[PDB]
């Protein structure tokens, strides 16, 4: 939902929330999303 959140406002609006205490099966990100671009400077998604 924070991805399904219709709140991506702007640059001088770049509210950032401390997401914490998740267990996110990041697979979701690179699997159940098809979220078009995924440049991941740093760690590889496979072991994310």
């Amino acid at each position: 939902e924070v991805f399904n959140a219709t709140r991506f406002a702007s640059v001088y609006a770049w509210n950032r929330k401390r997401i914490s205490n998740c267990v996110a099966d990041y697979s979701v990100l690179y699997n159940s999303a098809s979220f078009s671009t995924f440049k991941c400077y740093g760690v590889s998604p496979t072991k994310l």
Binding site: Y30, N31, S34, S36, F38, P45, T46
Partner: protein, 48 residues
């Protein structure tokens, strides 16, 4: 045009067109995860 080759094989298919980035040696998504995968040490050309 100045080399002599061995075991040259081709591959043909049709894709939706946004996954034309997924035919690279090392990518993520349900085309290079479920359908077609290239080895990391690839030698050859992709033509689209």
């Amino acid at each position: 045009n100045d080399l002599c080759f061995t075991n040259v094989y081709a591959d043909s298919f049709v894709i939706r067109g946004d996954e034309v980035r997924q035919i690279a040696p090392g990518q993520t998504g349900k085309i290079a995860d479920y359908n077609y995968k290239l080895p990391d040490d690839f030698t050859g050309c992709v033509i689209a």
